[PDB]
Ligand binder design. Structure first.
Ligand SMILES: [Mg+2]
Ligand SMILES: [Mg+2]
Ligand SMILES: [Mg+2]
Ligand SMILES: [Mg+2]
Ligand SMILES: [Mg+2]
Ligand SMILES: [Mg+2]
Ligand SMILES: [Mg+2]
Ligand SMILES: [Mg+2]
Ligand SMILES: [Mg+2]
Ligand SMILES: [Mg+2]
Ligand SMILES: [Mg+2]
Ligand SMILES: [Mg+2]
Ligand SMILES: [Mg+2]
Ligand SMILES: [Mg+2]
Ligand SMILES: [Mg+2]
Ligand SMILES: [Mg+2]
Ligand SMILES: [Mg+2]
Ligand SMILES: [Mg+2]
Ligand SMILES: [Mg+2]
Ligand SMILES: [Mg+2]
Ligand SMILES: [Mg+2]
Ligand SMILES: [Mg+2]
Ligand SMILES: [Mg+2]
Ligand SMILES: [Mg+2]
Ligand SMILES: [Mg+2]
Ligand SMILES: [Mg+2]
Ligand SMILES: [Mg+2]
Ligand SMILES: [Mg+2]
Ligand SMILES: [Mg+2]
Ligand SMILES: [Mg+2]
Ligand SMILES: [Mg+2]
Ligand SMILES: [Mg+2]
Ligand SMILES: [Mg+2]
Ligand SMILES: [Mg+2]
Ligand SMILES: [Mg+2]
Ligand SMILES: [Mg+2]
Ligand SMILES: [Mg+2]
Ligand SMILES: [Mg+2]
Ligand SMILES: [Mg+2]
Ligand SMILES: [Mg+2]
Ligand SMILES: [Mg+2]
Ligand SMILES: [Mg+2]
Ligand SMILES: [Mg+2]
Ligand SMILES: [Mg+2]
Ligand SMILES: [Mg+2]
Ligand SMILES: [Mg+2]
Ligand SMILES: [Mg+2]
Ligand SMILES: [Mg+2]
Ligand SMILES: [Mg+2]
Ligand SMILES: [Mg+2]
Ligand SMILES: [Mg+2]
Ligand SMILES: [Mg+2]
Ligand SMILES: [Mg+2]
Ligand SMILES: [Mg+2]
Ligand SMILES: [Mg+2]
Ligand SMILES: [Mg+2]
Ligand SMILES: [Zn+2]
Lengths: 150, 234, 208, 138
RNA sequence: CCUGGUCCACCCGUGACGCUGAGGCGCGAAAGCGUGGGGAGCAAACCGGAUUAGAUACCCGGGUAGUCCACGCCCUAAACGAUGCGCGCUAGGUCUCUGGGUCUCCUGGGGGCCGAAGCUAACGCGUUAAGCGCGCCGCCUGGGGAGUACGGCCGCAAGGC
RNA sequence: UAGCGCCGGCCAACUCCGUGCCAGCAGCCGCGGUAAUACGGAGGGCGCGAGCGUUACCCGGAUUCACUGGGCGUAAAGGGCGUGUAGGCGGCCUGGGGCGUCCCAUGUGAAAGACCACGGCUCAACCGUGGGGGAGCGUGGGAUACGCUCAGGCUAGACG
């Protein structure tokens, strides 16, 4: 059903009289490679607990990606903080031309041919968030049609 | 299920410091205080109540929230005067949003209703005997109405969205329809079914909240006569 | 040169059966057959999660290590495939499937691809009549891959084209066992091939 | 004095929609009117009419939005998610029919002004002309 | 007394006469410079007392330039809102200064604070924008070397650009 | 005939011994002061193969001079302020011109190269033939929404 991908895991530290106190951050992608993708970022005392928490959170955050012959209905450029993502539609045979973060998402989203580009802050966390916002914003001829029918 | 000249209260409420959004529902300001346009109060009732009956005559569970100490009694009654649960005292963080958790409190309250009526009542010195005394006490004060909910309500009937803002926000988040009696100092856009009118003055809080339970009953066919809250209206 | 050396070791590193010996790779001995862990003093220790990079690298190797082509030629072919029309991944595979040494393999004139290659460089093969000793020679569609009479009487050719009797062959091909000749009918359609390779990943190893 | 009146209108519209106004006025001009004519036909606005504010000619631009949404922030989606001025005084932008751009794989439009009049990229392409790429809208 | 700017009302006159602005010219706190004058108090330098391990300081007693006026020069600064100017557009609340009105309030110009949408790395900004846009100028392009060297222009000099 | 580079991360490939902030490595981050996957060696491994590394240099990644495609409160960045020259920019309506702009046709745009197809050398590199595109500019004809210019008009900017 849903395939999970781990974007990254960081160790993060905090301070107390005595020393440092770690936590673990986990960014996890989940999708059915059939138009549904979810992002999840969970943290916990230990990695596993974190990951699991991430996965659990991903499923809580789903996006309905309007796949088309394997690509996206058009181009969007989304800015999440200092990270900017650029998604450009492509023909078949192209493949998923993207950095690891946007890829993992696009792939589990069902996207198969797409032109991508990371601009601004390359921060994986905000890039991944930038992506979901991009996809989430994709519209369709029918969608526009609906909106401008009035 | 009617009445138009209900100017017996409502309208004109909350000094000038409003919320421009609620401006659509305002008639005018006289000697300070915005006066809610009743013609519209009506219009909204019609639509809101519809949503109510429809979801009422379908076995819909509705949670009533009215902490405003002002109309803090006119709520539990009409609530109890229907299956409907209620939050009378204070709204807690997670009622709906952390429901699976806060439910453990209820699945603990009825858990004490037990002990406080068995052979174990006389156990452990007052030490562990008094800890569990207060244990109940409070629960029964906060979870008196939240007792009934066994799953997120199909809707929420808030009396003052602004006051009961945390609640509304949780409905919203969980796509739980939000019905609410609101006025001049609130963000209508957050109320799915608005009952624009006096958010204060028990008289007005009664007239509406009351009739709402009427239509709830009438819809559930079990037709009933007047309500016993008209007493606290003094 | 083209590798030359411990081969059922590549099989092991790639963790899958690569047929670089034809026979024996079917017997209870291809090593992949009982001893599946990669070669070297470390092959049995628990493996660490491979980097996306590692995957494509290994994936490209798997595919290339199959046809015995050099990174050089492999790369050039892929580039040609990219520039060409049609879904590159597909086109790439077909282009590889068009190498003469390979056809000589598909047709069975030889057990393995390496053996096949030698049969080409040694002139035992013919294309439309004239002999061709270029393992990398690209076969067009309609060409007649064959054995040169002067070679039809060699013990190896015999055992080989014999074992081919009754044995069926790729749908994009055709074989006349007695005439020791076959035909390259069509560029194999991707679906016709059943290689243990996800070529999409290869296209990606070369995009980086 | 307005510096770029078309840009003004483009912005007045942009702004007004972000706060979901019913309508919004803009000082009138044939040219602005002509663009509106397109915004309307393409269905980005419920349309527009000429009003006379405080004695002077304006153009009520009736805006259009999607429907109330679920969860928090029920504000409707925008019909006009984007509207950018392109050619501008001090960097005029022209294009040949061969250079007319395609806004969002067709899901959007580009309004250019041509000697055959103010057209969309579709219309322009049809009449086979090009011109000053006025703005982008989607 | 002489003189600049500016705000409101009336809607009276002109009829796009507008915005910005490289260079130019003018102004530009303090200290400093030149000539003359002035000099109560203060006070670089300096002369001493004390403190201290020392005390070329902080504390105390003195004290010159200077601080003041005139005329000329210098042109710098955390010269700050560390936020160039103009215009249009985008919830409100509250305090305040100044004007007009039908004056328990409406309307205009200014000063504050909170805050819609939105913006922002965040802090924050938010009709006095750091929002949404157009016009023009100025300026940045990792740190140290260095605001130095050289050259040029300016200045009596110190130095400035 | 088989060799060369590499195996701490970036970056594909790991263990023993030696050494002991030494000797040494090093593209960046860094590694060595007695357990070093980072030093030297060895076994083993990855990569490529008549090559493989190194050094230098150009473009890339670098939207890191940002036209596409950046910025300036506190990160580097608003000129100390004004006045104002050149210059850049310019409210609403009408008409003339048609300079910018757009359109059609035509000339030009050598060959080679690049791209596509087919063909010759057993293949390929290499080469042959044929095909297609092409900005810019010249010429002729045309359009007039926007910019421009000329003429008239207006009052919402500005000034009085
Ligand atoms: Mg880090
Ligand atoms: Mg940014
Ligand atoms: Mg990435
Ligand atoms: Mg960066
Ligand atoms: Mg291709
Ligand atoms: Mg452009
Ligand atoms: Mg007048
Ligand atoms: Mg006149
Ligand atoms: Mg000026
Ligand atoms: Mg001065
Ligand atoms: Mg002075
Ligand atoms: Mg003096
Ligand atoms: Mg003197
Ligand atoms: Mg003194
Ligand atoms: Mg002393
Ligand atoms: Mg002293
Ligand atoms: Mg300036
Ligand atoms: Mg105020
Ligand atoms: Mg007054
Ligand atoms: Mg004010
Ligand atoms: Mg004021
Ligand atoms: Mg906000
Ligand atoms: Mg901005
Ligand atoms: Mg924060
Ligand atoms: Mg604020
Ligand atoms: Mg430097
Ligand atoms: Mg340097
Ligand atoms: Mg200096
Ligand atoms: Mg001099
Ligand atoms: Mg590795
Ligand atoms: Mg080491
Ligand atoms: Mg050791
Ligand atoms: Mg190393
Ligand atoms: Mg070593
Ligand atoms: Mg070679
Ligand atoms: Mg470079
Ligand atoms: Mg560049
Ligand atoms: Mg650089
Ligand atoms: Mg730019
Ligand atoms: Mg920058
Ligand atoms: Mg600083
Ligand atoms: Mg700074
Ligand atoms: Mg300033
Ligand atoms: Mg400065
Ligand atoms: Mg001028
Ligand atoms: Mg004009
Ligand atoms: Mg004309
Ligand atoms: Mg004209
Ligand atoms: Mg012309
Ligand atoms: Mg031409
Ligand atoms: Mg040529
Ligand atoms: Mg040939
Ligand atoms: Mg040629
Ligand atoms: Mg011509
Ligand atoms: Mg004409
Ligand atoms: Mg005129
Ligand atoms: Zn094998």
């Amino acid at each position: 059903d849903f395939e999970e991908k781990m974007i990254l895991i960081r160790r993060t530290a905090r301070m107390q009289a005595g020393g440092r106190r770690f936590r673990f951050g986990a960014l996890v992608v989940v999708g059915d490679r059939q138009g549904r993708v979810g992002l999840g970022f969970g943290k916990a005392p230990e990695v596993p607990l974190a990951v699991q928490k991430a996965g659990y959170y991903a499923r809580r955050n789903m996006v309905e990606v309007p796949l088309q012959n394997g690509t996206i209905p058009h181009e969007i450029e989304v800015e999440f903080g200092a990270s900017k993502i650029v998604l450009k539609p492509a023909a078949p045979g192209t493949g998923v031309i993207a950095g690891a973060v946007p890829r993992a998402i696009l792939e589990l989203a069902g996207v198969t041919d797409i032109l991508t580009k990371e601009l601004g802050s390359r921060n994986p966390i905000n890039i991944a968030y930038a992506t979901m916002e991009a996809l989430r914003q994709l519209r369709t001829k029918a969608d526009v049609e609906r909106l401008r029918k009035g | 299920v009617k009445e138009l000249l209900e100017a017996g209260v409502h309208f004109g409420h909350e000094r000038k410091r409003w919320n421009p959004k609620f401006a659509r529902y305002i008639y005018a300001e006289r000697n300070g205080i915005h006066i809610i346009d009743l013609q519209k109060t009506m219009e909204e009732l019609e639509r809101t109540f519809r949503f109510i009956e429809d979801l009422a005559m379908r076995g819909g569970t509705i949670l009533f929230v009215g902490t405003k100490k002002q109309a803090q009694d006119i709520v539990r009654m009409e609530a109890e005067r229907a299956g409907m649960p209620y939050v009378n005292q204070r709204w807690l963080g997670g009622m709906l949003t952390n429901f699976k958790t806060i439910s453990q409190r209820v699945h603990r309250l009825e858990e004490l209703e037990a002990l406080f009526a068995s052979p174990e009542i006389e156990e452990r010195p007052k030490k562990e005997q008094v800890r569990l005394k207060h244990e109940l006490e409070r629960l029964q004060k906060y979870l008196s109405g939240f007792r009934l909910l066994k799953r997120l309500p199909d809707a929420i009937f808030v009396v003052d969205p602004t006051k009961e803002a945390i609640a509304v926000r949780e409905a919203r988040k969980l796509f739980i329809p939000v019905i609410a009696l609101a006025d001049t100092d609130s963000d209508p856009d957050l109320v799915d079914y608005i009952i624009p009118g006096n958010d204060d003055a028990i008289r007005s809080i009664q007239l509406i909240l009351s009739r709402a339970v009427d239509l709830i009953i009438q819809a559930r066919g079990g037709v009933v006569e007047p309500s016993p809250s008209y007493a606290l209206v003094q | 040169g083209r590798y030359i050396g411990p081969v059922c070791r590549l099989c092991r590193r790639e963790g899958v059966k690569l047929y670089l010996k034809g026979e024996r790779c079917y017997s209870p001995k291809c090593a992949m057959e009982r001893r599946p862990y990669p070669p070297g003093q470390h092959g049995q220790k628990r493996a660490r999660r491979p980097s996306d990079y590692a995957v494509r690298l290994r994936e490209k190797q798997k595919l290339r290590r199959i046809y015995g082509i050099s990174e050089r030629q492999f790369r050039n072919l892929f580039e040609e495939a990219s520039k060409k029309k049609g879904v590159t991944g597909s086109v790439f595979l077909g282009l590889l499937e068009s190498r003469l040494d390979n056809v000589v393999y598909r047709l069975g004139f030889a057990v393995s691809r390496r053996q096949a290659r030698q049969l080409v460089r040694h002139g035992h093969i013919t294309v439309n009549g004239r002999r061709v000793d270029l393992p990398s020679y690209r076969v067009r569609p309609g060409d007649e891959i064959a054995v040169a009479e002067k070679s039809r009487n060699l013990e190896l050719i015999r055992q080989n084209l014999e074992a081919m009797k009754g044995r069926k062959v790729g749908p994009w091909l055709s074989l006349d066992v007695e005439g020791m000749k076959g035909k390259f009918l069509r560029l194999p359609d991707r679906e016709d091939l059943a290689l243990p390779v996800n070529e999409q990943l290869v296209i990606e190893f070369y995009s980086r | 004095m307005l510096t770029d009146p078309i840009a003004d209108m483009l912005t007045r519209i942009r702004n007004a929609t972000r706060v979901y106004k019913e309508s919004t006025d803009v000082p009138a001009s044939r040219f602005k009117e002509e663009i509106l004519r397109i915004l309307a036909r393409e269905g980005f606005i419920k349309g527009y009419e000429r009003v006379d504010v405080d004695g002077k000619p304006y153009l009520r631009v009736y805006l259009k939005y999607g429907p109330r949404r679920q969860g928090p922030d029920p504000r409707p989606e925008q019909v006009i998610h984007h509207i950018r001025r392109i050619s501008k005084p001090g960097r005029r932008v022209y294009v040949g029919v061969k250079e007319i751009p395609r806004v969002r794989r067709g899901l959007g439009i580009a309004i250019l002004s041509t000697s055959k009049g103010v057209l969309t990229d579709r219309e322009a392409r049809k009449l086979g002309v090009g011109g000053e790429l006025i703005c982008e809208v989607w």
